[PDB]
Amino acid sequence: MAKIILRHLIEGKSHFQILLDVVQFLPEDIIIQTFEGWLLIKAQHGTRMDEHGFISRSFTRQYKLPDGVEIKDLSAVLCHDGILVVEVK
């Protein structure tokens, strides 16, 4: 008799936004630290199996604030899709 199939599972002014592409860099590896005003983040992926050959990484990026900005109003978020955004809401 016939086969059964499974289912389930579901800017301009007054704001500043910085969405980056976090590849296979896990949130336990990625760290978003804000100093005086410049928004900083570091990927740092340890020496993992990486299928074919064993690979490692490190991606530290610092983004400059647009003068009138306080490092407290900014609230970052690393989306499940991969894109990690640091914006003020």
Partner: protein, 130 residues
């Protein structure tokens, strides 16, 4: 993309460093990605982000280590600094030395090394003590 991986395409803004793997299988005898065939052990990498002087390749024993690391630049969003130390596992047949590498204008290192240096043997099976 959604929970069942049903995607809905989006770009608009800027992005950061790194890349995605190429076509490769498992359960072999040897271990952008590898393209090692019977006689010629070739490789490929997207080293486009890094300058030729920043790239350093060495064969520490049987592992062709491809080290990078580049300090802060202009990019497009701001000051971005990257680093990567991708190592490849070559079989016992392939010579640890006599490894060629070519960086393209596009920014791609196309590593190569021929097979034929050792006999390459072994299986062995141990017994349980209980």
């Amino acid at each position: 993309x959604x929970x069942x991986x049903x995607x809905x395409x989006x770009x608009x803004x800027x992005x950061x460093x790194x890349x995605x793997x190429x076509x490769x299988x498992x359960x072999x005898x040897x271990x952008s990605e590898l393209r090692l065939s019977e006689g010629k052990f070739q490789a490929f990498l997207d080293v486009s982000h890094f300058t030729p002087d920043e790239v350093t390749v060495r064969t520490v024993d049987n592992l062709l280590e491809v080290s990078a690391r580049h300090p802060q630049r202009l990019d497009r969003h701001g000051f971005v600094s990257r680093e990567f130390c991708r190592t490849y596992v070559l079989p016992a047949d392939v010579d640890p030395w006599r490894v060629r590498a070519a960086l393209s204008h596009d920014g791609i290192l196309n590593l190569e090394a021929p097979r034929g240096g050792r006999h390459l043997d072994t299986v062995n099976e141990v017994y349980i003590s209980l």
